[PDB]
Symmetry: D2
Subunit: 425 residues, 4 copies
């Protein structure tokens, strides 16, 4: 029905293994990855990656989120970076095969006894310029997150706050920080100076694990492909680090100086893309899914209940994709927390939600711009078919494939409760 060749690709022999030891033993360098790359790439924008033409190359290479480091540059400089990013993104708004939404993240300068005057001003700039994410520097306690939240003024409550853990206090107060944050960034640069360098891997693995348990995005950052700032190829330790961040459970991987000031920004994005695809296929879904399953508490929220049912159904038939209709991105996030091997194609009318779902591993956003149908059920089918036709166009789907479709019983956010098994025609 699928062929012997299908079961030799994307580490399927290693995925069938009964133990983790057998899984490692069955990893094959000749087993090619087939699924789309699911770990998002955050690229820091700087002199090496600011031009509209250079940004088009980086979008094509795999950049999903553009990071603006507010430790350097003026508001005028960053507004120009935003405009250049938006111009390069909208240059693909014709052909859907190349049109991909790109998120814009503001990385704050940091504190000091409270939120800094500069941080308050930069956060206000982010709201005024419609940024999607804030990477809040040096978060030490829950009250730091609340201060950043307060600063996202009256109009920026939809912006996602990703708290950067950069010191011992942040590591120790992690649970209270994650509870009030949208996600976490393992800011290894400062963390490696604040705590012993040989202890950073424990902090990374712990934080990634707790974020996977909570179902919140986690970013692995700093010195991932450091040598690529000057050299065209990375070291053996660097490719290993990227692969292990993906295997650890990181939703996003980041490039700092590699894309901001280095000689090979596009090549660094291409390298992260190549390694992430390989590492995602090497994930031991058998144990991962059962552990996520057992660790997740019982839920009476129909979205959460539908998400696990959909991911279970996708594994049962080797579904090509899970197509989900989402207004805020939440239904796609709850599918993503169970780490399916199937791509989560999220169809949304919210341009912000389409940009923000790049924070979640395996979510492929589609922005729907069609005029609404008079009958709601008709409008729902039109978006499901949009997901299928885009999936076909991009290579995710083919006729005869099975897809899982996640929808809700009534319009508006918060009513996801339906899972359909559909044959692609």
């Amino acid at each position: 029905e699928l062929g012997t060749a299908f079961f030799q690709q994307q580490q399927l022999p290693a995925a069938m293994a009964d133990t983790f030891l057998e899984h490692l033993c069955l990893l094959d360098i000749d087993s090619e990855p087939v699924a789309a790359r699911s770990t998002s790439i955050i690229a820091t924008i700087g002199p090496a990656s600011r031009s509209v033409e250079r940004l088009k190359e980086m979008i094509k290479a795999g950049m999903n989120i553009a990071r603006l480091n507010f430790s350097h540059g003026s508001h005028e400089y960053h507004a120009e970076s935003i405009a250049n990013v938006r111009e390069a993104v909208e240059s693909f708004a014709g052909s859907p095969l190349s049109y991909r939404p790109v998120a814009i993240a503001l990385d704050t300068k940091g504190p000091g006894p409270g939120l800094s005057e500069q941080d308050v001003r930069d956060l206000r700039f982010g709201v005024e310029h419609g940024v999607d994410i804030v990477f809040a520097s040096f978060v030490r306690k829950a009250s730091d997150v609340a201060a950043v939240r307060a600063a996202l003024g009256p109009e920026g409550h939809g912006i996602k706050i990703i708290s950067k853990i950069e010191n011992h206090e942040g590591v120790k107060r992690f649970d209270e920080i994650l509870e009030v944050s949208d996600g976490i960034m393992v800011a290894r640069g400062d963390l490696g100076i604040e705590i012993p360098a040989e202890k950073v891997f424990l902090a990374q693995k712990m934080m990634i694990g707790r974020c996977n348990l909570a179902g919140k995005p986690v970013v692995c950052a700093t010195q991932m492909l450091e040598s690529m700032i000057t050299k065209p190829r990375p070291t053996r330790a660097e490719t290993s680090d990227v692969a292990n961040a993906v295997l650890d459970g990181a939703d996003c991987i980041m490039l700092s100086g590699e894309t901001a000031k280095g000689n090979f920004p596009v090549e660094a994005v291409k390298m992260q893309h190549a390694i992430a695809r390989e590492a995602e296929a090497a994930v031991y879904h058998r144990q991962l899914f059962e552990e996520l399953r057992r660790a997740a508490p019982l839920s009476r929220d129909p979205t959460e209940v539908t998400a696990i049912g959909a991911v279970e159904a996708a594994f049962k038939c080797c579904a090509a994709a899970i197509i989900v209709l989402t207004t805020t991105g939440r239904s796609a996030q709850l599918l993503s927390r169970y780490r399916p091997r199937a791509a989560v194609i999220a169809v949304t009318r919210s341009a912000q939600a389409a940009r923000q779902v790049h924070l979640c591993r395996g979510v492929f956003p589609l922005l729907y711009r069609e005029p609404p149908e008079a009958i709601w059920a008709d409008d729902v089918d039109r978006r499901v078919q949009f997901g299928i036709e885009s999936g076909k166009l991009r290579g995710f789907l083919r006729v005869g494939d099975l897809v899982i479709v996640v929808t809700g019983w009534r319009p508006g956010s918060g009513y996801t409760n339906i899972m359909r098994v559909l044959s692609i025609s």
Copy 2:
């Protein structure tokens, strides 16, 4: 509530090991779920009366067995009529009507190699009188099942064939017999004479395990409550035997002389009901569900894919029930094979399918009598509501419960593909 988590062996169900599970079993933890293992009662002089059969239906009898080793065709036609009269005496209240299957147990081949002439005549009698199941005696090979199928003719295509394994050859050729049969009966009486008495438990446990693996019904039969033929209470070995047949994985438990000729046919049914409810709550679903999921192969059939997604969703929210619309009973059978703790309420218009789904553990058949609505989505909703109303009346559901609703995308058998999370109002 705290009280909810003390009932139906919920502390023992949360255990991380089978040893801890046994240690947490509580005699004060009352069973809450409806009894899911079916009771087959053999009809005879002690249970032939229409008034006596009404008491047995109320006590829990799901399948009426006609032993064709005794009695004439005239005798068995009268048994069938009395059963049908007692069953239809409750059809005035459709929300509480309980369907009862009629099974013909053949006399067997005796000294002969193949299908006896009496068996051919009895099988044609069964087709003419509309029996739902055939318990084919002394099945030794796949060709014996084919001969029974041939004797049933074109009109008996819908009758279910449950092969009785009564000797060493049947045990050795088990796989080929199960492949062509609808299910199996562990006929312990003859099996205990054909093979050493001390080896029968190995044959019972093996056959039950293989039927659970295959997703096909398995009946445990003979001497389960033997002492209740003359005594009002069973022995300690007898209650233990019933409990262990349920814990082994048997879909059905049987009463022979206990209901056919004894002095306690109603009490024997009540006893089997009481023990089965206790034993079903003591099932270690944590290990069982994982093992059934792991052992079940990948499938591209949307009914099979929806079934596993629905059972996974039911466990996630502690769903009170899984309401399924079924024409042939197949959708209910595929839900049943994953052994959910949630009751599988099967709503059907087929009176034969409603009788035959009693062969599957945890399937509660509801016969829907209304003629089809003009709008198909309205006819579907009306059936789902009938399942909710019946389930509320019978104690399966209460307001505030979560239920998983399993339906299809078009009318007719074979199109189940939808799973939706519903809240009882």
Copy 3:
């Protein structure tokens, strides 16, 4: 297949078809059930002990010799019936039949004698008759007391007090026969040597459909605690009058063994029934089949995970020895024991290898029948001058008895468990020996 491939080439394909070995290699319990084979013959010696109640049907010395040969390990004296004179005669007849085989020490089979008390009845504590019967047991050298209707830890303390200073070595097995005993189980097990699931009274005190929950819970907790547990009453009830049992009865025996019971009992089946020897033979046949059907892969891991860390060298050596025995498919584990404790600690990890316990204590040899898989050997030789040579003679005695009885063959591996100095409590050594 790679985890057995070499041992398969060495021991042969036939070895791996016997004693439910394909079912034992299974990765899941479902696969284990699926692989159970009626043609896979049991090879190991029967490890669950058989307790036979002595009565009119089983009192003659000649009848008792047949029952010893059939598999009876413990003789139960029901003090609810019969006088002290009657029970002293039963004891004498049992001892006469047991000692009739003492001529060959390499094949002698010890038999324990257990006194089952009448109980408190309407009373709150120890009855006057129980005090008199317990005093009789001490005077007649009984090995075990099955204390009727134990409801709390103070009941077991009263039985211990009644046994006095001379009955300190007697094992107290508390009978759980009512709701209070089930609810206060943990405190009762803590102060008892073991438990008996007295299903007859328990089935009247609590709903009959709840007894299996009580049986499975108590057996599980006793397995967790490492203390003996007996399953009792109506196991082969129909065999009192019929030569073959019902399908529910064989199932019940098999399931008590599969549950984790150390001992299985016969009451009326041997005390008054027409087939006492046939009932013992039936329990023996079913137990041997059920023991091979145990899913040791999950059982050993669960016992291992549930057992807390220990700093007692006997406990540490016991787990190391059972692990070593599973690694090489050891035919037996030979252990030197004074009180039976080292053998009991090996037994709690439920090895598939027979635990051959070599002891000089005739009482310990009788009492280790309470522990599943322990095969007692009574050493009658006087002590050697060098202790290190006395120990080596006791190990060789175990190897010779094991060879003589069919437990060991040339080429087999055996695990030997000993201590560093004489006296009880110093077990700390494990050795891997090849049988020549």
Copy 4:
């Protein structure tokens, strides 16, 4: 306090997810560092005084890269290593043996090159303990190296370097005839796509752990430390992940051979390895190793598993084993105990070679012999206890597992004892 150290809360976890969640940066490692450090000897690490600092820092194996330097140069390196090692022999209870490994130049465009035949004969003549055979592609390559060592080099360990696609594809046949493997990531990263090397590393480490044979992770582990005093975040992560993968040895090439911070690179590998070893999820690892290991009728193999099981049961501080060839210690090591495997040996070569096995701490027995063999055994067991106490492995009140044999000579290990310290 004992249960808060060495990631013990994370070790008690019922799932790997819970294990990651419980990892604590404040939980200090207490056990001795188990993963051996191989340091490449070069201009930056050749002086006797420099080598004493590297021995003190944690270097267990000295690698001589025969791709550069003459036989005269390498003989001087060997002499300087031996001089620095023997400078600590005055205190036998604290003396640390150091192995010497010859890394061959390789076949290049060619079977076994003429230079390799000459270098292998040099190794035999100079008493090297290990050979890291470059570019092994098939079992016949290993046989050729074995032949070039001759009858005088029967005891040298051959660690095959997997550096290309053919070596990865023919891995099983190479491991079968080799003593161990080296994941030579430098050449492997050029021969196969750079993004596929982690799959080859994890597969080879897993198969070596399965086989019970040593596996070395090599190349660019702390590369930036050649010029900088601190490594990158990717580098510390790489070292930690090689240990977490199951590597018996970790290597330093340019970092120690030509770099500005050779001692600091050794100290860094030591610090990371200790942290990573405590973060190992022994609950799942031991079970998987147990299940995957086949049934055995060799009493050494049977005693090894029984001893590791007993060590976990009592939280044994160490497993003291008497070994002639190092085999009994290797069979204990394959089950990855948390307890240190203190191997007491009279063979100086076996003491150097057991560094290839993770968690084996070699002690050279140089005390006078007892007339009664039973007394000679108990004295060697007391030697292990005294060296253990002095080095911090043992304290009074600890439990130890002692592994011995029934008769003198190699191949007779069959006894395990539970002993209380003092």
